[PDB]
Point group: C2
Chain length 332, copies 2
């Protein structure tokens, strides 16, 4: 029906603005106001946070357009999809604020002749901000379970792809007096993690170093590697692949962290067989995005292959069904 | 519970709709849409090879489109979906939203705070905007624009286009009037570059030229000698940039003075709507209003345009309604 088609396509258009707005409204404080008080006064909010009021009105109207919010007067009210969208807001942020420039440039990123050198760009600072909540909301119950089952109190912990630095911080809050080292390949991750450990008071327990975990022998921070007895790596396992490169890299890690006992690896994985009209949140963005970036994404079943060959024993495996098909491995 | 399941689907639809939206503009640009339109279907691998594209990304693009109904995948093949004809109709609007204006909306957290609203506080892609607007013009404004051209009362010899963009409006004028000289003014280098490329390639290199400038201070624009020859003036999709009202009045006068031999001035634009319920917003409107509000650019209503012309030194002779794109309009001025 021509009218159903028109309403659908309009909804597709507006969903773009709503999607971009969710992450923005989180970052700026609006989603938190609404969860707390069920409602807010748009002018008041705009003045409180010193925001351009007409743009604010738009942001909320974009949210309203798809049911996240409902406007009555100068009041914004929690809408029927508020609780779902708010729960998942870090995913929208990662898609838009974080990875938005990648998808924007689709027509320049697909042609083979452009897929050379640095042919896409994302905002590493924003990815770090999103992934900090993605960790908490989706990965944490399995991560802490694995931490509870270590068998030992760790001393020096190393985190590959540290991002916001928040994992290392939370580990230090639990094990007071541990030392932390974060390796991330991106200047914006490093910078955010440094400001964050500084603000939060751990500046002499936790350091960071810019570096590539795939070329771990070339990372500049020699000193502390051999003292590390806990290794963590979250949301970047797939950067180790294809299969050969992953095996060789896993072996380099076992060699450069001789005294690591447990290695906790958490990641999302390429799904199989999900019908197109039923893709849950995140899945399509994760898979399409990485395919655009020329970054290999293994199935869960591919991972099983590689641990023993890379010189590691897989002791425990946790399913995370809350975020596409995700997993935590406890390796030894 | 129920309901929790409905909210879950609706939010997932919003997430994937972002990907579909961005893919609509892209599949347009790379020719997947034209090909699906012609043949009703295509082979994804064959399409990747013909156009030398990274095949895994190509699968994502069609999968993104398929996630919301625009297309369906059958095996290794792609087939027209139920929302195909409509998304294809409005594809230039998505291109405008994504490929053109996407940086604006991406940076909403850094664009809204007043403390940052200084200097170059947002970025868009002027080339891409030109590309999309070329089709927006043909798809939504042409009927009314050629009605106006037909009813000029004379045959133009020199046309100036303000906010020239792709340069395609000047090209089409020249097709219709083999005599005419054309001059386009745009404030953006990406528009100029695009339009110089287009006109050379289409063979109109010696008839049409372009100059970088700000139509708001038209009076201070370099190629002034050529302006006095002009007998048709056009302006499409940037008239709001002349606002607020006070500014629009002064600019209207500078144009009158900068173009003394202009007989007609055709002015086309989209305007700010009022009272559309949030869940009943059609395509484009929200994007147009929210984006200009983020950019800090005034958007007059239709009535607001009516006041201003006489005060700006012009008289409105004919007015066309365009309900195919938000609320849009073409004015014939004199
Ligand atoms: C999505 S994030 C997750 C951040 C963090 N681990 C967390 O749980 O919040 C993945 C991070 O890994 C980093 N990264 C990606 N490839 C890498 C590599 N080869 N070496 C080091 N870091 C990498 C990225 O810069 C990004 O900060
Ligand atoms: C939306 S586009 C339309 C392009 C073209 N007129 C068409 O109809 O396809 C608007 C154009 O206005 C130009 N523009 C905006 N403000 C301007 C100004 N103050 N002076 C000159 N050009 C301007 C932009 O560079 C852009 O190319
Ligand atoms: O940004 C990336 O490149 C990621 O891989 C991000 C990610 C991966 C898995 C879960 C959530 C985010
Ligand atoms: O890109 C802009 O700033 C525009 O004003 C675009 C536009 C305006 C009116 C109709 C179509 C596009
Ligand atoms: O092979 C697997 O499925 C996991 O990679 C790790 C594991 C293996 C055996 C028993 C438990 C966990
Ligand atoms: O004032 C108006 O309504 C239009 O701006 C132009 C117009 C005026 C009178 C008759 C026709 C057209
Ligand atoms: Ca209130
Ligand atoms: Ca509603
Ligand atoms: Ca582009
Ligand atoms: Ca970026
Ligand atoms: Ca290095
Ligand atoms: Ca190495
Ligand atoms: Ca779902
Ligand atoms: Ca379908
Ligand atoms: Ca941002
Ligand atoms: Ca900027
Ligand atoms: Ca841009
Ligand atoms: Ca100028
Ligand atoms: Ca509609
Ligand atoms: Fe990744
Ligand atoms: Fe505009």
């Amino acid at each position: 029906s021509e009218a159903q088609a028109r309403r659908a396509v309009a909804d597709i258009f507006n969903s773009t603005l709503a999607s971009s707005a969710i992450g923005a409204a989180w970052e700026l404080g609006a989603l938190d106001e609404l969860r707390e008080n069920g409602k807010l006064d748009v002018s008041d909010f705009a003045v409180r946070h010193d925001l351009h009021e007409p743009a604010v009105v738009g942001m909320f109207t974009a949210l309203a357009s798809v049911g996240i919010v409902r406007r009555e007067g100068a009041t914004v009210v929690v809408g029927p999809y508020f609780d779902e969208a708010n729960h998942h807001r870090s995913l929208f942020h990662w898609l838009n604020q974080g990875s938005g420039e990648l998808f924007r440039r689709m027509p320049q990123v697909l042609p083979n002749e452009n897929r050379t050198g640095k042919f896409y760009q994302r905002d590493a600072g924003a990815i770090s901000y999103a992934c900090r909540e993605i960790s908490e909301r989706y990965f944490d119950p399995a991560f802490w379970a694995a931490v509870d089952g270590l068998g030992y109190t760790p001393t020096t912990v190393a985190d590959l792809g540290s991002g916001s630095g928040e994992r290392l911080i939370q580990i230090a809050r639990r094990f007071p007096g541990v030392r932390g080292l974060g390796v991330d390949i991106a200047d914006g991750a490093i910078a955010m993690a440094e400001k964050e450990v500084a603000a939060k008071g751990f500046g002499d327990q936790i350091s960071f170093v810019r570096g590539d975990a795939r070329t771990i022998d070339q990372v500049s921070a020699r000193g502390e590697f051999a003292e590390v007895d806990l290794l963590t790596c979250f949301m970047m396992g797939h950067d180790f692949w294809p299969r050969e490169n992953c095996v060789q890299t896993l072996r380099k890690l076992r060699a450069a962290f001789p005294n690591v006992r447990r290695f906790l690896l958490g990641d999302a994985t390429r799904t199989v067989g999900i019908p197109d009209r039923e893709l849950p949140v995140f899945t399509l963005g994760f898979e399409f995005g990485h395919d655009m970036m020329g970054v290999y994404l293994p199935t869960l079943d591919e991972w099983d292959g590689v641990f023993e060959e890379g010189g590691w024993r897989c002791v425990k495996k946790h399913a995370i069904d809350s975020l596409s098909v995700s997993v935590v491995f406890e390796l030894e």
